[PDB]
Design a protein around this ligand. Structure first.
Ligand code: DGD
Ligand code: DGD
Ligand code: CLA
Ligand code: CLA
Ligand code: CLA
Ligand code: CLA
Ligand code: CLA
Ligand code: CLA
Ligand code: BCR
Ligand code: BCR
Ligand code: OEX
Ligand code: CL
Ligand code: FE2
Lengths: 145, 450, 34, 31, 50, 34, 136, 333, 59, 37, 75
């Protein structure tokens, strides 16, 4: 008793039917295969995460001005670790904050500078690392816009 | 029907494809049609995964197996491994489907209406299985094609939008590999190093520069070899150790491809560089290291002095010393001390796991990554229950690394078996006693007793 | 010998494939599916 | 017509079809 | 141990001595096989000609 | 213990080269029929 | 025995008011909880931090009380420590950390209400295994 | 006549008491050193720490063991997957403390069995017979490789390989059940079916052949003495055996082409063992068997136990006890 | 339009696949009916190009 | 999810990947049609 | 008579298209109407526990098993 033909000859069930792919009424299952809905409730795209992103950028600055001190001494692991441990949120933050074409292009320039810094630090060339850090500083403090 | 019957051929219906050994046109048709089948599966599966895609979950939780490759190539992926759009995957799928239709038509035409033997009408595509010059010519042509493909990958990574790099500064993202490593010593160090723990014969490639350089080298080698085999003829030393027949060539290919399948299976299980953990999920050792790391952080929050608490065996339950002296996580995960992950490297110094960085400079994103990886370990069941074998079934997840590794290991061994079978049969048939003994020239009766 | 053997073989194969498929669909929707 | 075969065959086949019908109905009977 | 390593030669002595065994074999093999350029049999795995 | 490594590296290359050059010495010709 | 009216009544607020979850709600919850919560909170236990469990007894001893639907929903809106001294939204899934965790970028109120209802209701059904662990 | 030629000839000779061949050049020294080290270690190997927790386990006869409890304990967990030859240790005593002999013996044994397969094929070629016995021998070789090499590779440590002993084998099997659920894996089912069917078919074939034996002996003389080595006619009557087999089960159901019968005899256990080795290999990468835990639920939601849940209970009992001191964190990853 | 355009493409591809394998086999059938098959091939590629042009424009 | 244009054609994609397996079988059914000649 | 000849016979399928589906439908209705629960005494999904007992209903006696089961299977 209590049948359950592929949601077509019976009913829902406090737990048994699965063919459903619907039968919920709540609203739109994004796709017939997703319990979740679309991005139209609760979380808003740009509530106050922009303040957190700006704070991340400021502390990214604060992290990046201590790199020349670490390259003055012959320490290379510290440069890579510093450039990757807290800058991790900075890539996404800078990408999301940028909205105009100039911001996009020069954020790309900043990413180029950081990648050059990483490569030169791996290759252990002090001059290239220092120049790349200077260029990264210029791009980043010219980003605050 | 002359060629299609156990009488005319001598081959039963179940071993029916062996009737095409000496038929050139139909064999070409079969090969082309099979390639069309491969392309069709690729396109269809890409479209299937794009249809069933859900933007909330990461790709390694959706049971996806192909979106990860195209994402690693740098298609529709943002910083941190977030998927932006799924349009390029749809484009790849539809292009593959159309090309598969074309290839299937070609295979059908060549199998049904095409001339049975290409030697008579097209004395450029005809072969004999016995002359070496034409065999080496075909081998060289396809070798040049493979070299061009390797070049194409290098070109894509260097000047066509770049590829996804986990070890990139600021997190994983798409970048251009401007300066690949071209030093032959460093490139062939992978090829000629040990396959044991701590070495990782070709699986232990770390950065993208090594990947690009190795591909440049492979393309150059393949181009040179393809040119060389086309022009030259097999030498004397190789002319008397090889069996020159179609089945022998098939057996050689089977052995080589079984080795390649084993390598790919073990390569998907250990590598983080070409298999980013943000797309395929954490590896075996990565989950264990993540568990140790997250429990270390949790116990440190309470105020316990990490790196001073003796374990139950007196060995140290948070920080240990590796048999080489490096400082590593304690517990059973000391076997995985060779691990190098993008979210754990910031904490590593020249001496190993730095302690001052752990005590002070810890990051919340590392905590989140470690918790997510511990909660998603490459553990599961055949019905995809997920978790440990004794766990109840509420989650539904099996890591794609496990699927890839298991499936390809199975296929690789069975192709090794195919190599054994076909090599034995090819050599016996070339010798001339693959059907029986003789009953009048039995070699055992002509040999000294013992 | 009116109906060819492979026709009834194909019909039986379709029937058995159907029945077995109904079994897995069930391992998934109903009792025993959790 | 009813040879031993017919018998044994039918005694093995009738319950088989009955049970298969029963088992299929079950696959729907959903809690 | 885990020090990568081209092959596993760590000391020039080890390479220079894994050398004479292979070269000894090459010499004993060359003793039979020398001054061979042609004699193409053109048959399925025949190599009948010595 | 470097001496022990040297001796084992010899034995191994010894036997491996024996194998490689034994199978290179026109093995397919070695056979009941000719 | 069925999932009757008596067993579908759960506490809705600190006072003690008790609302009733419609069967649809139950289903949606069990689904949403297994999809999002399940990976770490399977069986009513916390996998990463086993001390802070999910069983009703531990929720009753949290600060503030977390043994009703409203406090669970607020906790999802704004998660705090066990004693409630500070917020841990940066290290725990929440609506506040929707940017950090993309899973909640789509969750709605009813969704939260159903998830909280499932968390409240499951210990009324199992009654000894919700948060029990291997032993049970 | 050169020297190389003369050698090559002696090597590939088919008149030597035991065939050497080119694969023998790899099989003989390797198997000989493996067996020498195994025999010495089974008698006088000092205790070895296997879990890398400084808790050595004795496995030698001279350390209060018997034949069943004795074993060659696998290498330490601290080493993991790292290569540990003799010359990498600072002393032989230390090499013995970390279980190097296990690695030595297992690597040599694997190379030896591979060369054994090759040598089987080589002799088949020399004697002018059809070359597929080594394909049949591949199944035990695949199983041994999966249990000794592939599983440690997947798990990440040589300490997870099967110890060379009786009680060690039982311990390995029990821990495998606890951590992986081997019984509920369809490939283990296929292997059990293959082994049981192999025994069944062996017994039945032997009974059918021996029962129908042409009367060529008295009663006071072994029935086996009727057959003479190098006969030209079949000593058994296929017709009578097939008549008995057909009358026993069914007429249609019966093999006549004795060649097909023997091919089926070879096919069944070999494919069974191949599938089993694939089960072990797949489960080395944590693709466990079916988990039907709490699958049956009543209307309310309470769980109704099945026979699988008692299996899970036994697995929990084994799991919470294995390697009692090795674990520090809740999950076994 | 795209949705429809493709629908057609699917229908014409089905009609082509059900009839090409039967043609080639049936001895002779091919040649005699070659030009209609060529025309349908041109229709097929035209439909594909039309679908691609739709998308592009519509994005 | 597929682009909005092809969400209507989704059900065909739901079955497309399993096609090849059937090709295999076709071989067997084709051999059965010709009496496993 | 060999099996294949019977299988391909038309007069066979004219007596195997009014017998087999009817038997299948009867087997379906055997449990669709819920008779099988009563015939074999197996509990329905809503009869595992009752309001009075919330544990497994085990039999403890041997010669009074009938009454014990009758009581347990009250509700
Ligand atoms: C017998 C003696 C021969 C032994 C040969 C087999 C050894 C295979 C092995 O130890 O394999 C292990 C290695 C994997 O190497 C691992 O490589 C890893 C690479 O990871 C490193 O690199 C990664 C890249 O980022 C990550 O950074 C990771 O964190 C970092 O640790 C680590 O180095 C591990 O320590 C190291 O074990 O496989 C390899 O390299 C590839 C192996 C080729 C395939 C071999 C087939 C396996 C044999 C199956 C036989 C089947 C039976 C058939 C016979 C019948
Ligand atoms: C005697 C009888 C047996 C004799 C054998 C010969 C007769 C064959 C009988 C076949 C029995 C099974 C029939 C097919 C049923 C099937 O498959 O079952 C259907 C399932 C699909 O079901 C879906 O399977 C999903 C599996 O989860 C996947 O999806 C989930 C959704 O997020 C998660 O992402 C999870 O991580 C991911 O794994 C979920 O369970 C869904 O709820 C469920 O609908 O299989 C699928 O995927 C379908 C496609 C499977 C193809 C993959 C095969 C290759 C896999 C590599 C294996 C190599 C071998 C390794 C060694 C073994
Ligand atoms: C990828 C798998 C594959 C491929 C490419 C082939 C290919 C071939 N096989 Mg074959 N075979 C296979 C698997 C395969 N086989 C398997 C698994 C078995 C075991 C059962 C066999 C057993 C077998 C035997 C016993 C024989 C062959 C033969 C042949 C050759 C001639 C076939 C023929 O005349 O068809 C005739 C069949 C048909 C005309 C009916 C099939 C109709 C079409 C082709 C089906 C596909 C239509 C497709 C879906 C439509 C797409 C259209 C496109 C425009 C989109 C041909 C090269 C024969 C041979 O040796 O040739 C000399 C032969 O005697 N095969
Ligand atoms: C590229 C790889 C490749 C190629 C081109 C060939 C080619 C050939 N093989 Mg071969 N083989 C291979 C790999 C390959 N093999 C491997 C890896 C193995 C090890 C298992 C073998 C083992 C093997 C044997 C033992 C024999 C051949 C034979 C042959 C010849 C005839 C085969 C034939 O007619 O197929 C016919 C194809 C079939 C009958 C299909 C059978 C289907 C299999 C049994 C099941 C597949 C299961 C699949 C994975 C999933 C099933 C799904 C299902 C649940 C729905 C032909 C030259 C025969 C020979 O000697 O010819 C001279 C022969 O006796 N092969
Ligand atoms: C590996 C793939 C491959 C290979 C080796 C061949 C090889 C060949 N094809 Mg071909 N073909 C292929 C794929 C392939 N085809 C595909 C995918 C299709 C479908 C688009 C076709 C459709 C096709 C047709 C329609 C015809 C050929 C023909 C030919 C033959 C003469 C070709 C020629 O003059 O080229 C010259 C090029 C350089 C010298 C030759 C044996 C012809 C043939 O044999 O019939 C007379 C022919 O009419 N092919
Ligand atoms: C798929 C890849 C592939 C394959 C199958 C072959 C196959 C072959 N090569 Mg090779 N080769 C390749 C790629 C390949 N090559 C590449 C990429 C290069 C460039 C480094 C070479 C350079 C090369 C040389 C220099 C020689 C061979 C030789 C040979 C033959 C004997 C192989 C042997 O005993 O070892 C054989 C035909 C030998 C031969 O017989 O020469 C004709 C030989 O002397 N190859
Ligand atoms: C059931 C059959 C089956 C299926 C479905 C798969 C499926 C798969 N295999 Mg596979 N495999 C199989 C059997 C199968 N295998 C067998 C029998 C063997 C032999 C034992 C192997 C051996 C094998 C290896 C060795 C590897 C795979 C891999 C893979 C995966 C990726 C395939 C890929 O991208 O190749 C693509 C292959 C090509 C030839 C495509 C060439 C395209 C290059 C062109 C350049 C592209 C460029 C960068 C982009 C262009 C952009 C433009 C603007 C220019 C995929 C999941 C790979 C993997 O992920 O490993 C885990 C892998 O490395 N397989
Ligand atoms: C009618 C004018 C027209 C327009 C506006 C486009 C526009 C486009 N085509 Mg297109 N195309 C056209 C005609 C056109 N095509 C014709 C006549 C053909 C031949 C039949 C093609 C064949 C073609 C192919 C094969 C591909 C494109 C692709 C693309 C897109 C690549 C640019 C991109 O990524 O932007 C950003 C666009 C998006 C993010 C969404 C699209 C772009 C939207 C590529 C594509 O869609 O990849 C995604 C692709 O692979 N086109
Ligand atoms: C010889 C032979 C054989 C083989 C054959 C082959 C192998 C074939 C192949 C074939 C093929 C391989 C085919 C393919 C086809 C394809 C197609 C036909 C496609 C189509 C497509 C479409 C139609 C699409 C559409 C769409 C779009 C555009 C968009 C999105 C949606 C969709 C997807 C819908 C066999 C074994 C049988 C048998 C013996 C003989
Ligand atoms: C891409 C890449 C890479 C790679 C590269 C390379 C460059 C590679 C190569 C590779 C190679 C380079 C390989 C090779 C191999 C080889 C082999 C595998 C061989 C084999 C041999 C044989 C098999 C032989 C046999 C024999 C004998 C032994 C005796 C006599 C007879 C005969 C001849 C048969 C890397 C990793 C870096 C990184 C990533 C990317
Ligand atoms: O070592 Mn032998 O048994 Ca493979 O899981 Mn983890 O580790 Mn230990 O525990 Mn469970
Ligand atoms: Cl641990
Ligand atoms: Fe026998």
């Amino acid at each position: 008793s209590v049948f359950g033909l592929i949601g077509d000859g019976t009913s829902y069930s406090e737990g048994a039917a699965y063919g459903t792919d619907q039968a919920d009424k709540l609203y739109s299952p994004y796709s017939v295969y997703s319990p979740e809905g679309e991005k139209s409730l609760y979380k808003p795209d740009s509530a106050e995460y922009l303040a957190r992103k700006k704070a991340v950028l400021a502390e990214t600055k604060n992290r990046l001005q201590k790199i020349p001190g670490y390259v003055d001494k012959k320490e290379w692991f510290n440069v890579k670790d510093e450039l990757t441990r807290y800058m991790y949120e900075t890539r996404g933050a800078v990408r999301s904050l940028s909205s105009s074409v100039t911001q996009k292009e020069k954020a790309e320039v900043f990413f180029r500078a950081l990648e050059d810094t990483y490569g030169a630090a791996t290759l252990k060339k002090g001059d290239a690392v220092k120049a790349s850090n200077d260029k990264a500083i210029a791009a980043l403090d010219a980003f605050t816009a | 029907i002359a060629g299609r019957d156990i009488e005319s051929t001598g081959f039963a219906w179940w071993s029916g494809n062996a009737r095409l050994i000496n038929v050139s046109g139909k064999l070409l048709g079969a090969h082309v049609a099979h390639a069309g089948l491969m392309v069709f599966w690729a396109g269809a599966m890409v479209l299937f995964e794009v249809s069933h895609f859900v933007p909330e979950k990461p790709t390694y939780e959706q049971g996806f197996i192909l979106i990860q490759h195209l994402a690693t190539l740098g298609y529709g992926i943002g910083p941190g491994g977030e998927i932006t759009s799924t349009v390029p995957y749809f484009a790849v799928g539809v292009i593959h489907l159309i090309s598969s239709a074309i290839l299937g038509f070609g295979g059908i035409y060549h199998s049904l209406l095409g001339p049975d033997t290409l030697e008579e009408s097209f004395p450029f595509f005809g072969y004999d299985w016995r002359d070496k010059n034409k065999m080496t010519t075909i081998l060289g042509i396809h070798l040049c094609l493979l070299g061009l493909g390797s070049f194409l990958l290098v070109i894509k990574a260097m000047y066509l939008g770049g590829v996804y790099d986990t070890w990139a500064p600021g997190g994983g993202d798409v970048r251009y590999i401007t300066t690949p490593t071209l030093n032959p010593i460093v490139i062939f160090g992978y090829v000629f190093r040990s396959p044991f723990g701590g070495d990782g014969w070709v699986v232990s490639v770390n950065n993208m520069e090594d990947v690009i350089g190795g591909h440049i080298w492979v393309g150059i080698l393949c181009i040179v070899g393809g040119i060389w085999h086309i022009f030259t003829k097999p030498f004397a030393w190789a002319r008397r150790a090889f069996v020159w027949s179609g089945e022998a060539y098939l057996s050689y290919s089977l052995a080589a491809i079984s080795l390649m399948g084993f390598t790919a299976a073990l390569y998907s299980w250990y590598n983080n560089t070409a298999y980013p953990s943000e797309l395929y999920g954490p590896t075996g050792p990565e989950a264990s290291q993540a568990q140790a790391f997250t429990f270390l952080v949790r116990d440190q929050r309470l105020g316990a002095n990490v790196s001073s608490a003796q374990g139950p065996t007196g060995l140290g339950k948070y920080l240990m010393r590796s048999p080489s002296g490096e400082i590593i996580f304690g517990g059973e995960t000391m076997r995985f001390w060779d691990l190098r992950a993008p979210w754990v490297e910031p904490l590593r110094g020249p001496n190993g796991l730095d302690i001052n960085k752990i005590k002070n400079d810890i990051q919340p994103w590392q905590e989140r990554r470690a918790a997510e990886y511990m909660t998603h370990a490459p553990l599961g069941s055949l019905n995809s229950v997920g978790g440990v074998a004794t766990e109840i079934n509420s989650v539904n997840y099996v890591s794609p690394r496990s699927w890839l590794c298991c499936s390809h290991f199975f296929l690789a061994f069975f192709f090794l078996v195919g190599h054994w079978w076909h090599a034995g049969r090819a050599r016996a048939a070339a010798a001339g006693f693959e059907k029986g003994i003789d009953r009048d020239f039995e070699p055992v009766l002509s040999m000294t007793p013992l | 010998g009116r109906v060819p053997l492979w026709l009834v073989g194909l019909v039986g194969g379709f029937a058995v494939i159907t029945i077995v498929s109904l079994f897995i669909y069930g391992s998934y929707s109903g009792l025993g599916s959790s | 017509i009813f040879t031993f075969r017919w018998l044994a065959v039918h005694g093995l086949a009738i319950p088989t079809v009955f049970f298969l019908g029963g088992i299929t109905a079950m696959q729907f009977i959903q809690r | 141990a885990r020090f990568a390593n081209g092959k596993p030669q760590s000391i020039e002595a080890k390479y220079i001595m894994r050398s004479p065994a292979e070269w000894d074999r090459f010499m004993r093999f060359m003793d039979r096989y020398a001054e061979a350029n042609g004699l193409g049999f053109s048959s399925x795995x025949x190599x009948x000609x010595x | 213990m470097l001496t022990l490594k040297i001796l084992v590296y010899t034995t191994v290359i010894f036997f491996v080269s024996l194998f490689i050059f034994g199978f290179l010495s026109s093995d397919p010709s070695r056979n009941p029929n000719r | 025995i069925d999932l009757d009216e008596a067993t579908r009544t759960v506490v809705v607020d600190n006072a003690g008011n008790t609302t009733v979850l419609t069967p649809e709600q139950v289903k949606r919850g069990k689904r949403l909880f297994n999809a999002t919560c399940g990976a770490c909170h399977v069986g009513g236990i916390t996998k990463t931090n086993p001390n802070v469990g999910l069983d009703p007894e531990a929720l009753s001893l949290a600060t503030p009380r977390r043994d009703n639907i409203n406090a669970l929903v607020d906790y999802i809106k704004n998660p705090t420590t066990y004693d409630g001294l500070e917020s841990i939204a940066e290290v725990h899934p929440s609506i506040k950390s929707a940017d950090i965790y993309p899973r909640m970028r789509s969750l709605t109120d009813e969704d939260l209400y159903s998830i909280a209802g499932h968390i409240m209701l499951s210990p009324k059904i199992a009654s000894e295994k919700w948060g029990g662990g291997k032993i049970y | 006549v050169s020297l190389w030629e003369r050698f090559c000839a002696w090597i590939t000779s088919t008149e030597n008491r035991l065939y050497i061949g080119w694969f023998g050049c790899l099989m003989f020294p390797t198997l000989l050193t493996a067996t020498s080290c195994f025999i010495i270690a089974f008698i006088a190997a000092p205790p070895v720490d296997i879990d890398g927790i400084r808790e050595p386990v004795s496995g030698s006869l001279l350390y209060g063991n018997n034949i069943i409890s004795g074993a060659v304990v696998p290498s330490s967990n601290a080493i993991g997957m790292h290569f540990y030859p003799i010359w990498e240790a600072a002393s032989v005593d230390e090499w013995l403390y970390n279980g190097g002999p296990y690695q030595l013996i297992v690597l040599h044994f694997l190379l030896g069995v591979s060369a054994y397969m090759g040598r089987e094929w080589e002799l088949s070629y020399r004697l002018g017979m059809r070359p597929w016995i080594f394909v049949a021998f591949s199944a035990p070789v695949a199983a041994a490789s999966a249990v000794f090499l592939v599983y440690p590779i997947g798990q990440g440590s040589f300490s997870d390989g099967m110890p060379l002993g009786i009680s060690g084998t039982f311990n390995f099997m029990l821990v495998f059940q606890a951590e992986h659920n081997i019984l509920m894996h369809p490939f283990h089912m296929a292997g059990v079916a293959g082994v049981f069917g192999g025994s069944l078919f062996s017994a039945m074939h032997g009974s059918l052949v021996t029962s129908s034996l042409i009367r060529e002996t008295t009663e006071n003389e072994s029935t086996n003495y009727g057959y003479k080595f190098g006969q030209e006619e079949e000593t058994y009557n296929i017709v009578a055996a097939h008549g008995y087999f057909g009358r026993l089960i069914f007429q249609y159901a019966s093999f006549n082409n004795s060649r097909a019968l023997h091919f089926f005899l070879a096919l069944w256990p070999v494919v069974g063992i191949w599938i089993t080795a694939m089960g072990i290999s797949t489960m080395a990468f944590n693709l466990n068997g079916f988990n039907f835990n709490q699958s049956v639920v009543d209307s309310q939601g309470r769980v109704i136990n099945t026979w699988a849940d008692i299996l899970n209970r036994a697995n929990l009992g084994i799991e919470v006890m294995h390697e009692r001191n090795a674990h520090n964190f809740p999950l076994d990853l | 339009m795209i949705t429809a355009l493709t629908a057609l493409f699917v229908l014409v591809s089905l009609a082509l696949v059900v009839t090409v394998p039967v043609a080639l086999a049936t001895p002779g059938e091919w040649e005699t009916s070659k030009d209609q098959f060529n025309k349908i091939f041109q229709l097929w590629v035209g439909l594909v190009v039309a679908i691609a042009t739709a998308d592009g424009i519509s994005t | 999810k597929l682009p909005e244009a092809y969400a209507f054609l989704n059900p065909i994609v739901d079955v497309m990947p399993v096609i090849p397996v059937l090709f295999f079988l076709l071989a067997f059914v084709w051999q059965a049609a010709v009496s496993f000649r | 008579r060999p099996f294949s000849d019977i299988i391909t016979s038309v007069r066979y399928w004219i007596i195997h298209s009014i017998t087999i589906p009817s038997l299948f439908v009867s087997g379906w209705l055997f449990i669709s109407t819920g008779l099988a629960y009563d015939v074999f005494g197996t509990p329905r999904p809503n009869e595992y526990f009752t309001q009075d007992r919330q544990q497994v209903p085990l039999v403890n006696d041997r010669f009074s098993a009938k009454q014990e089961l009758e009581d347990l299977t009250k509700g």
